[PDB]
């Protein structure tokens, strides 16, 4: 049979490996202890070894964590939003410099490419240059998607009330604007905040509670370490406490960015989809509009198992 004592060392090697490939330390621990429980008291295959057995077990549970039950078909959800004659509202949020604003632009490009109109709501009213940053994007996009290429319709537009104003109220006026001017999607950009800055997390929660977006997306850099876990736990804990609903609106999906910087230390993807049981909706792989990928769960796990 397979006792815990036999697996003890190969399990320890796996844990250390996963940790080295940027899976959060406690997740690696929990991950491997699951593999232990699953295997205890079972017999191995005719030609299998204790190593090959736990290796395969680990690989399967990794694939399952990465592709979770709930998918997020975004264009399909937008199609449905169009039947109800309301805009589809997406809120991006996350800690500082992870790539909210820039991946919001990439997603706009993707939406425009499928023929939806998007109003970008500039609801980072704090950080220097946030508005001009989004303005630059809007200018770049509506040059790629001008009215003369869409029957005269304006397809992207920035909604901005400059710096200093309440984010939630701007988001509200934008969604209100999109309804009246016929914008298919509103993408709400929000300012970067630390996950345990009470005032800022309440502000974020207020913007979400007040405007009830269709999709809240957490944005996290793939470079991040153990912080991946804390950021999500506390963001999700903030949306649930500073909310006055029965089943409160939590984080719906993840945008894993800077994937092009981590080589095969690809572990942050496991860290995030393990705590939230939500899907990685897009992977960000660079700085241009073209650098947006889906998440190939089989192939990410492959990179994680290799070194």
């Amino acid at each position: 049979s397979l006792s815990r004592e036999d697996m003890e060392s190969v399990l320890d090697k796996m844990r250390d490996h996963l940790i080295a490939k940027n899976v959060a330390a406690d997740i690696a621990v929990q991950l491997c202890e699951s593999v232990a429980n699953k295997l205890e008291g079972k017999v191995m295959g005719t030609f299998s070894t204790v190593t090959s057995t736990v290796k395969q077990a680990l690989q399967e549970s990794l694939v399952q964590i990465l592709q979770p039950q709930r998918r997020v078909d975004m264009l399909r959800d937008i199609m449905d939003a169009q039947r109800r004659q309301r805009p589809y509202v997406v809120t991006f949020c996350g800690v500082n410099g992870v790539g909210k604003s820039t991946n919001l632009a990439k997603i706009s490009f993707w939406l425009l490419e499928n023929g939806f109109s998007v109003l970008i709501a500039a609801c980072d009213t704090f950080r220097a240059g946030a508005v001009e940053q989004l303005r630059t994007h809007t200018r770049r996009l509506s040059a790629l998607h001008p009215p003369e290429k869409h029957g005269g319709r304006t397809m992207v537009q920035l909604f901005e009330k400059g710096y200093g104003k309440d984010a939630a109220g701007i988001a509200m006026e934008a969604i209100a604007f999109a309804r009246n001017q016929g914008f298919d999607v509103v993408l709400v950009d929000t300012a970067g905040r630390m996950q345990d800055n009470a005032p800022l997390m309440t502000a974020l929660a207020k913007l979400i509670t007040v405007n009830t977006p269709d999709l809240v997306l957490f944005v996290g850099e793939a470079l991040v370490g153990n912080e991946a876990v804390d950021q999500l736990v506390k963001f999700n804990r903030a949306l649930a406490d500073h909310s006055m609903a029965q089943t409160p609106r939590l984080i719906d999906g993840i945008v894993l960015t800077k994937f092009d910087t981590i080589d095969d230390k690809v572990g942050a993807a496991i860290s995030m989809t393990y705590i939230t049981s939500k899907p990685i909706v897009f992977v960000g792989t660079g700085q241009t509009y073209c650098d947006l990928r889906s998440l190939n769960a089989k192939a990410v796990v492959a990179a994680l198992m290799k070194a």
Binding site: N22, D26, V95, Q133, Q195, V224, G225, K265
Partner: protein
């Protein structure tokens, strides 16, 4: 008693792993505190603390500007690590101490990069240079340093765009900016939340350009900044300042003792 060392020691290996210290370093620190050790959690936690100090200290004193000469400081680092904000942070630091300081924006890529630095600099009443139109960072940085030289500035801080080791193009462009303005100090700015991918990038930066100082940002939150041990290792450079928030005065000079304390528990 061999079991009371290890139980108390794998408990410290875990704290450090959770603090984003490179696993290589933990595996090494463990058998270092073990070899060198031959009321009980003090005889151990002290010898761990000492080995950690050896890791933050590169053995090199930090570069400092001289009053009355031209001091050019160039910032580099991964995308979104906090260079730009830390630029105005550092200028405001020197300016308040009575130096003639100024900021140059040599980012020609990031949307609204110049607007960002211009608003930062304008709020803090600090002279800046940059361009909405010029697309070659080397020309802005050159013509910027050249401008502020002619006006006898003491601290000329040059902000550059975020870049990462696998984009060979961007790493060349960095070396080209360095060669053009010939900085007296290159600062590598790093996010305190960075995971295991840190050593690799930092080495890559130091291998291409001459990094001589490190600043750690975003330490005001939950991250203990254990990546800094690897950054110091890779760049052979001391941590000079830490960033502790979004504002211009959320900045203080790095002190070794409190940082290792916070890193440990």
């Amino acid at each position: 008693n061999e079991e009371v060392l290890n139980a108390m020691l794998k408990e410290v290996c875990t704290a450090l792993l959770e603090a984003d210290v490179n696993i290589k370093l933990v595996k090494q620190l463990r058998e270092n505190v073990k070899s060198a050790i031959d009321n009980k959690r003090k005889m151990i936690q002290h010898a761990v603390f000492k080995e950690l100090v050896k890791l933050v200290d590169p053995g090199v004193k930090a570069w400092t500007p001289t009053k009355g000469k031209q001091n050019v400081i160039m910032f580099v680092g991964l995308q979104g690590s906090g260079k730009t904000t830390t630029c105005s942070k550092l200028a405001y630091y020197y300016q308040r101490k009575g130096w003639k300081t100024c900021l140059i924006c040599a980012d020609t890529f990031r949307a609204g990069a110049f607007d960002q630095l211009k608003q930062n600099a304008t709020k803090a009443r600090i002279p800046f240079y940059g361009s909405y139109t010029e697309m070659d960072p080397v020309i802005i940085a050159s013509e910027g340093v050249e401008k502020f030289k002619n006006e006898n500035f003491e601290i000329i801080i040059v902000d550059t765009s975020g870049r990462h080791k696998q984009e060979d193009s961007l790493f060349e462009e960095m070396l080209q900016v360095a060669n053009a303005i010939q900085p007296d100090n290159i600062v590598y700015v790093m996010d305190a939340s960075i995971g295991q991918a840190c050593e690799a990038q930092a080495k890559a930066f130091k291998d291409k350009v001459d990094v001589a100082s490190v600043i750690v940002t975003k330490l005001d939150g939950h991250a203990k900044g254990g990546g800094a041990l690897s950054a110091v290792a890779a760049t052979k450079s001391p941590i000079i300042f830490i960033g502790t928030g979004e504002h211009i005065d959320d900045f203080e000079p790095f002190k070794t003792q409190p940082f290792i304390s916070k890193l440990l528990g």
